[PDB]
Amino acid sequence: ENALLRYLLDKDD
Amino acid sequence: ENALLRYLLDKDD
Amino acid sequence: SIPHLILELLKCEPDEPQVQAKIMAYLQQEQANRSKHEKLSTFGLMCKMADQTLFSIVEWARSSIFFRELKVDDQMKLLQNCWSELLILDHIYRQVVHGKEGSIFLVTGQQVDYSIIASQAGATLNNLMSHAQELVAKLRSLQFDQREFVCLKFLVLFSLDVKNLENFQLVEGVQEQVNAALLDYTMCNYPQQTEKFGQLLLRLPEIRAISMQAEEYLYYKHLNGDVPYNNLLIEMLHA
Numbered sequence: 001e002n003a004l005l006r007y008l009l010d011k012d013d
Numbered sequence: 014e015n016a017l018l019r020y021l022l023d024k025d026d
Numbered sequence: 027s028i029p030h031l032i033l034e035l036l037k038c039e040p041d042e043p044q045v046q047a048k049i050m051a052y053l054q055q056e057q058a059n060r061s062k063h064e065k066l067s068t069f070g071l072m073c074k075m076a077d078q079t080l081f082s083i084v085e086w087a088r089s090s091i092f093f094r095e096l097k098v099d100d101q102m103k104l105l106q107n108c109w110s111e112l113l114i115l116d117h118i119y120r121q122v123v124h125g126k127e128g129s130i131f132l133v134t135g136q137q138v139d140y141s142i143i144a145s146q147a148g149a150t151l152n153n154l155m156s157h158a159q160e161l162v163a164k165l166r167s168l169q170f171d172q173r174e175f176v177c178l179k180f181l182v183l184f185s186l187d188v189k190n191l192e193n194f195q196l197v198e199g200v201q202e203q204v205n206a207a208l209l210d211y212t213m214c215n216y217p218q219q220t221e222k223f224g225q226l227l228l229r230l231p232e233i234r235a236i237s238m239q240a241e242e243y244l245y246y247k248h249l250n251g252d253v254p255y256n257n258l259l260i261e262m263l264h265a
């Protein structure tokens with residue numbers, strides 16, 4: 001599980 | 014909660 | 027005579043010249059980015075410094091003994107509790123070690139006349155800066171050293187006031203152990219000043235108070251439209 005991809009999914013626009 | 018804090022902690026350097 | 031624990035703490039410390047350079051480079055490369063239209067203020071610049079210093083604090087924390095063993099959810103709760111305290115503690119220690127009275131040693135590694143910052147700032151911020159100054163002075167007169175500094179950083183990070191921790195026991199364990207190591211270090215290294223241990227610990231409530239005031243003020247500034255885009259600082263402020 002790549003951390004960047006999770007951030008991209010989870011962050012506010 | 015903070016996607017960013019989470020990312021800064023998880024990312025694999 | 028430095029306890030083992032404290033040696034483990036010191037090994038976790040960042041390379042200060044490289045951190046200074048990194049932030050400094052970030053700020054230059056930011057003007058490059060920013061259009062020749064959009065301008066930036068002293069307050070704004072200091073917000074960016076705080077933001078970049080936060081990245082460095084999180085990095086320090088994630089690699090540190092004990093903190094590494096926590097689950098990320100616990101790591102987040104600990105950092106959300108203490109980020110502004112760690113900023114203040116880091117600032118204070120720089121003033122003591124690489125600074126002088128009448129001057130502010132910035133995290134980018136230069137000194138500027140206190141006057142030159144204070145003059146830019148209104149009364150609320152001046153008030154905060156003064157209290158910080160007195161802390162610096164108190165800790166200067168205590169002969170605050172790097173071994174003491176690292177202990178206080180761990181005591182701030184591994185706070186007992188943080189609710190809903192999974193592994194609260196590890197956190198209690200770290201508090202107790204760093205506490206005991208600090209007690210040893212002062213009695214072994216400063217044996218004629220038996221007050222030194224107590225004087226160090228009593229700075230922590232003062233740091234906590236100044237940090238809460240800083241946050242309230244910064245949130246005001248943010249809601250006022252005065253804080254330039256600053257993802258991590260404001261994410262922490264929203265915690």
Ligand SMILES: O=C(O)CCc1cc(-c2ccccc2)n(-c2cccc(C(F)(F)F)c2)n1
Pocket residue numbers: 072075076079110111113114116117131132133154155158236237240241244259
């Ligand atoms: O030189 C530094 O260390 C970087 C900039 C800085 C200075 C302070 C500060 C603020 C009040 C008293 C003492 C130092 N910074 C700071 C510390 C805690 C909280 C905040 C906040 F709330 F504005 F985000 C800023 N950041």
